[PDB]
RNA sequence: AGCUAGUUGGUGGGGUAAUGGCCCACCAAGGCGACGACGGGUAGCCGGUCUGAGAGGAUGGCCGGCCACAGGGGCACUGAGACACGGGCCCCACUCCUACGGGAGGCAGCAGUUAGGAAUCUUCCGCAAUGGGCGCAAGCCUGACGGAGCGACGCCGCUUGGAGGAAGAAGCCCUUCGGGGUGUAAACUCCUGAACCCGGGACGAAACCCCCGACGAGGGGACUGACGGUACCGGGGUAAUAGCGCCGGCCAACUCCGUGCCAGCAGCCGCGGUAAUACGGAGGGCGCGAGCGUUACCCGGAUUCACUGGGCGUAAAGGGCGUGUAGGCGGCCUGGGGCGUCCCAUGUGAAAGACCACGGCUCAACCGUGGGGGAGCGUGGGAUACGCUCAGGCUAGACGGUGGGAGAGGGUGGUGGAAUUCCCGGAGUAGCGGUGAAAUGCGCAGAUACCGGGAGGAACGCCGAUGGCGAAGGCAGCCACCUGGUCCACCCGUGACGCUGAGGCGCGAAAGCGUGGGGAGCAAACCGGAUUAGAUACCCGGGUAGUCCACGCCCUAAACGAUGCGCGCUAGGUCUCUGGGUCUCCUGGGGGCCGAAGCUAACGCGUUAAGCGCGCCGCCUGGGGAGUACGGCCGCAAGGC
RNA sequence: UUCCCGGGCCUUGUACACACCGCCCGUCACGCCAUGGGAGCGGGCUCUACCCGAAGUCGCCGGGAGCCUACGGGCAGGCGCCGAGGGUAGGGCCCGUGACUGGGGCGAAGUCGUAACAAGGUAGCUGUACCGGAAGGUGCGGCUGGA
RNA sequence: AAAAAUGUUCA
RNA sequence: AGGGGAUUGAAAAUCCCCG
RNA sequence: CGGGAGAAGGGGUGCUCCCUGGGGUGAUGAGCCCCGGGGAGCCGCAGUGAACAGGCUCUGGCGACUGUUUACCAAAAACACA
């Protein structure tokens, strides 16, 4: 492109999309589970991912998915999400944050724990 | 019809030398001698001469290459390793005082034009003006 | 994509502190827009802040400056100043009070409540200092301010100890069963001593006020501390919190067990299917540490919107081609102006922040003081190479003249022969046809094959090429008329008149469409026959629109060299079409091959460039979604842009 | 040595490479998601017009009525223009939602056939046109990225 | 100048 | 529909057997 | 694309007085008629003050349309029509 096209059309800034739309730029959004249902892995993988749906307080509804083993969430359960693609799961685009609200911590998790909100336990 | 004579100058110096030529004849004007001028007063090019190819006056300006190498590829070295053009027709160069270029970490060079004459990245400097950034050899 | 009635201007008024359709009469019809008017959306602006090597990109929270607003809307009054947040009037919404007869309120001040949300604090102390209002002053007010409180939200400082201590407890983990690791780590021994305890205790505060002089200048006297009995100094003085993430690669850190494409992990690549360094626990290790992680958002890396700093022959990308408007760009020489450009000086560029020193709190974080830099913009003086401009001149660009050339370039009118089909006539008989093989089909009602006469349509064999013409699409029998472009020669004329080209206008294969005409051959669809598992196909026999012409639409394409146009520059060899010459050769125009330098990811390109350069246009920015949807414009429709 | 099967080297084409026992197309079925059209239904923003029209400013008047006077005049009150908003009407722009309907994306091992890659077993592709379960077939014309 | 279709998933 | 045997590298699919 | 259009939805209309622009015949000046325009002001419930004088819109079916028809029960989606 010449300088005089430059100078006539000028180049064109990119302006990306929210690989995530939680709303208002934030951290975290909160909702109810809609459903509860278990999905199947994609392409190589095969196992029961568990998915749950959710009603998100911008009258949104979502997929969001659950970690570790083992969870309580019930079809009116309060829940907080947290955005995280489940990259193998079409669609599922945000994690629930575990440990919070109607989100029961990890049981027996003594690893990573920070992530899956399960109390430092005692040694004794 | 050349709309930058000046930066064909240039290029018919810049292709003579890919080749290896005694001389090259670029068409006559005053102040494209002046870029010559400058290329010799600072060691360039042989030098260069007024002709005339019937009623057509043209300037044979004289190349000057290195010594033969040892080994495949015997082709000597150039004396211009590289000339382009800045300041073009369709997008003038101005530069201030400050802004004059530092060719080659000092080794090249910048013919440029000013109110005051035809002056180098250094004499310019040195007059400490400014101009019209002709372009740049080395 | 067009917008506009106070709309644009005018004379005279009205209005104001004042200019002005700000407003009102009367008059004139103007005013703006692809340099983006008008309209929709979104938004407080800057100083700065964040990132970047920079250019840029993003941003406008704290503090400073400008504007705007005070539940929503309008209007004035008072006044130096307001259309005035804690003044007024009215309308509306909302909440409240009530003796149900009427009235009241306006936290976007401080603090606090509720709602919403992922989430953002004490209904604190004080006017002692600074600043502000009134007053002669004493002094009154000051949720401004000065301090304190709450939250690892941030920055900075600091602690959980220090020196010894085994060829090395225990426990726990590995183990080739010897041993190895955690590990000087611990215990243990010495010393230091955060916390806590007692004692002392601020700077910030000198003015206003009182006396002398004059109530001034100068000198002397006195009061005042929220924070706070806190900082800080001195004495005594106990070993006194550690966590989080990670360890397949990128990316620093590995072994055992469990589990068995389950459970689960996961930033991209990927892991788990019975020996997993990737899941879960463990021993160990790496990282950072009162923090460590996660999600979100901005810059970077991303030369991935490319001015710095990219591209389009096959990777995404040249417009189907042409003509040309605006616009962009422009040969050589001489002189005048000096707008761009360049230099000097001067104004400006608040403070804060950013950078350099130096000092103040024990350091730092904060903070003070001084210095140094700032684009931009104004004014004054000056320079004239380059761009601009006016003026004078030139002939290398471009255009013209006289004279000739080649060509399927285009349009109209006429014309020739070969073949196919049908019609009539003759002669003649048992099949012809078609195929891989067949069948359908045609034929004793006399076919095929042969001859003669005739009608009509469409295409033009040999020449013909690896050629020629055209801007592209495309153009072929022969002839004449009408007409375009292009090439050479002669140095005759003009004197930069040029290149490109948004929009516009024109042309634009085939198929398709409209009105009318024509119709032999071929032929989508269609019908039969075969093939096949089926055969809505390939093969066979039939067959309509169409293919043709006139006039008018549609406007697409592998509209391809898949290569925009113009000009300049950079080895040759070869054959070929065409032009000129004091013609084994020289020189001009075009088409092919091979190839210098050089270019390219490679293939290849290579004076017919994709080489080295300049001007201008067009266009690209991962794959699918999709050349789809919507809107608009065009079309009769199919559809197109 | 034609033909079936297998094997050598040279060559050609290639979209294959756990390599033709390869690869791969589209319809259909099932599941999840967004999305177009849609009789319409709901709400937000705006424009135009006329009807009522507060407060208030300004302009008249202040007459046969009132109040004040220092007789000039002032106030009250009357009328008008402007006017927030309110009403009625007819437009414009955007968002939501809607029976049903259209395609599209993605989802370990379902159905049907074989279009494409080797003359892909009728070169392929492509604009158009008709047609068919589906890929696709064929007609005209074009291109080589085919011979 | 060729009768002849296809061959589950991850490794 | 799950589980079990055969079968696979492990499935899918296919064959036999259960309240 | 003519048209949907009288779309819809509104406002004005009487009387008196003042100034003023062009027309026709005169004659170029005056009466005489002919179309306007601008200001004030008066009266009533009401000014096309009586009489003549459209209600409108959205949305389906059928038939293209103006037409024609059963004189005396059918005027149509029937007949006709280019
Ligand atoms: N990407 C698929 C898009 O849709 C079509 O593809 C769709 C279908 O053709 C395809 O269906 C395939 C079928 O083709 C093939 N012969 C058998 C296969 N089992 C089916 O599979 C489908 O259904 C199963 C569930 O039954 C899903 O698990 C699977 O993910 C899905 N692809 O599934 C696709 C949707 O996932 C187009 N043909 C394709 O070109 C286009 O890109
Ligand atoms: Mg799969
Ligand atoms: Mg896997
Ligand atoms: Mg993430
Ligand atoms: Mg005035
Ligand atoms: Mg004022
Ligand atoms: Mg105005
Ligand atoms: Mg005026
Ligand atoms: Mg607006
Ligand atoms: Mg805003
Ligand atoms: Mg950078
Ligand atoms: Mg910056
Ligand atoms: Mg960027
Ligand atoms: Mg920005
Ligand atoms: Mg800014
Ligand atoms: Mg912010
Ligand atoms: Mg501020
Ligand atoms: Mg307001
Ligand atoms: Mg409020
Ligand atoms: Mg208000
Ligand atoms: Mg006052
Ligand atoms: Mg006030
Ligand atoms: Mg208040
Ligand atoms: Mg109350
Ligand atoms: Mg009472
Ligand atoms: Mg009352
Ligand atoms: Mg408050
Ligand atoms: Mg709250
Ligand atoms: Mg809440
Ligand atoms: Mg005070
Ligand atoms: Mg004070
Ligand atoms: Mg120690
Ligand atoms: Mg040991
Ligand atoms: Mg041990
Ligand atoms: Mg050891
Ligand atoms: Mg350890
Ligand atoms: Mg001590
Ligand atoms: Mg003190
Ligand atoms: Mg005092
Ligand atoms: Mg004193
Ligand atoms: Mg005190
Ligand atoms: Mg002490
Ligand atoms: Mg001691
Ligand atoms: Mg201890
Ligand atoms: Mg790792
Ligand atoms: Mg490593
Ligand atoms: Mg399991
Ligand atoms: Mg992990
Ligand atoms: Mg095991
Ligand atoms: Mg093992
Ligand atoms: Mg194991
Ligand atoms: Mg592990
Ligand atoms: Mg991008
Ligand atoms: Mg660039
Ligand atoms: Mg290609
Ligand atoms: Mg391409
Ligand atoms: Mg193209
Ligand atoms: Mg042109
Ligand atoms: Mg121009
Ligand atoms: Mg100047
Ligand atoms: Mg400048
Ligand atoms: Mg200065
Ligand atoms: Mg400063
Ligand atoms: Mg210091
Ligand atoms: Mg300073
Ligand atoms: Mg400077
Ligand atoms: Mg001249
Ligand atoms: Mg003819
Ligand atoms: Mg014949
Ligand atoms: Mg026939
Ligand atoms: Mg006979
Ligand atoms: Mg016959
Ligand atoms: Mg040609
Ligand atoms: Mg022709
Ligand atoms: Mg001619
Ligand atoms: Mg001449
Ligand atoms: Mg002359
Ligand atoms: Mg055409
Ligand atoms: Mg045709
Ligand atoms: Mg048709
Ligand atoms: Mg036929
Ligand atoms: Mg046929
Ligand atoms: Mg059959
Ligand atoms: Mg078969
Ligand atoms: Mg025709
Ligand atoms: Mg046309
Ligand atoms: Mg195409
Ligand atoms: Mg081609
Ligand atoms: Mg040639
Ligand atoms: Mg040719
Ligand atoms: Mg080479
Ligand atoms: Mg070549
Ligand atoms: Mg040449
Ligand atoms: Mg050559
Ligand atoms: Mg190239
Ligand atoms: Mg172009
Ligand atoms: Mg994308
Ligand atoms: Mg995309
Ligand atoms: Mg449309
Ligand atoms: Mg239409
Ligand atoms: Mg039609
Ligand atoms: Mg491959
Ligand atoms: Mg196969
Ligand atoms: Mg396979
Ligand atoms: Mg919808
Ligand atoms: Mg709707
Ligand atoms: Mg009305
Ligand atoms: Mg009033
Ligand atoms: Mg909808
Ligand atoms: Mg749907
Ligand atoms: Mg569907
Ligand atoms: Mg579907
Ligand atoms: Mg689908
Ligand atoms: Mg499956
Ligand atoms: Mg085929
Ligand atoms: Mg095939
Ligand atoms: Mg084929
Ligand atoms: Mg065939
Ligand atoms: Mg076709
Ligand atoms: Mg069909
Ligand atoms: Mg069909
Ligand atoms: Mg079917
Ligand atoms: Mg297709
Ligand atoms: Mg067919
Ligand atoms: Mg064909
Ligand atoms: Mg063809
Ligand atoms: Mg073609
Ligand atoms: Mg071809
Ligand atoms: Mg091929
Ligand atoms: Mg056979
Ligand atoms: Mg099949
Ligand atoms: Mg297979
Ligand atoms: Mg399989
Ligand atoms: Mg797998
Ligand atoms: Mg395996
Ligand atoms: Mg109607
Ligand atoms: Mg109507
Ligand atoms: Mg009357
Ligand atoms: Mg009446
Ligand atoms: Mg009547
Ligand atoms: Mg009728
Ligand atoms: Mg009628
Ligand atoms: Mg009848
Ligand atoms: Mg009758
Ligand atoms: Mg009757
Ligand atoms: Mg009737
Ligand atoms: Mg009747």
Not at chain 1, 85 to 110: E, M, N, Q, S, T
Not at chain 2, 108 to 121: C, E, F, H, P, R
Request: charged share 35%; aromatic share 6%; hydrophobic share 30%.
């Amino acid at each position: 492109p010449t300088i005089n096209q430059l100078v006539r059309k000028g180049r064109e800034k990119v302006r990306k999309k929210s690989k995530v739309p939680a709303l208002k730029g934030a951290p975290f959004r909160r909702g109810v589970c809609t459903v509860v249902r278990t999905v199947t892995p994609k392409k190589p993988n095969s196992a029961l991912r568990k998915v749950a749906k959710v009603r998100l307080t911008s009258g949104y509804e979502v997929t969001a998915y659950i970690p570790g083993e083992g969870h309580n969430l019930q079809e009116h359960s309060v829940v907080l999400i947290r955005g995280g693609r489940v990259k193998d799961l079409p669609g599922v685009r945000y994690h629930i944050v575990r440990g919070v609200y109607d989100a029961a911590g990890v049981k027996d998790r003594k690893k990573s724990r920070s992530k899956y909100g399960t109390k430092k336990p005692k040694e004794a | 019809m050349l709309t930058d004579p000046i930066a064909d100058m240039l290029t018919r110096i810049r292709n003579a030398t890919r080749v290896y030529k005694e001389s090259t004849d670029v068409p006559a004007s005053r102040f494209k001698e002046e870029i010559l001028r400058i290329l010799a007063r600072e060691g360039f090019i042989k030098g260069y001469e007024r002709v005339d190819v019937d009623g057509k006056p043209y300037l044979r300006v004289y190349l000057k290459y290195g010594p033969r190498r040892q080994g495949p590829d015997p082709r000597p070295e150039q004396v211009i390793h590289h000339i382009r053009r800045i300041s073009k027709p369709g997008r003038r160069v101005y530069v201030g005082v400050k802004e004059i270029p530092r060719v080659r970490r000092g080794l090249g060079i910048a013919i440029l034009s000013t109110s005051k004459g035809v002056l180098t990245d250094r004499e310019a400097r040195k007059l400490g003006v400014g101009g019209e950034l002709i372009c740049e050899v080395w």
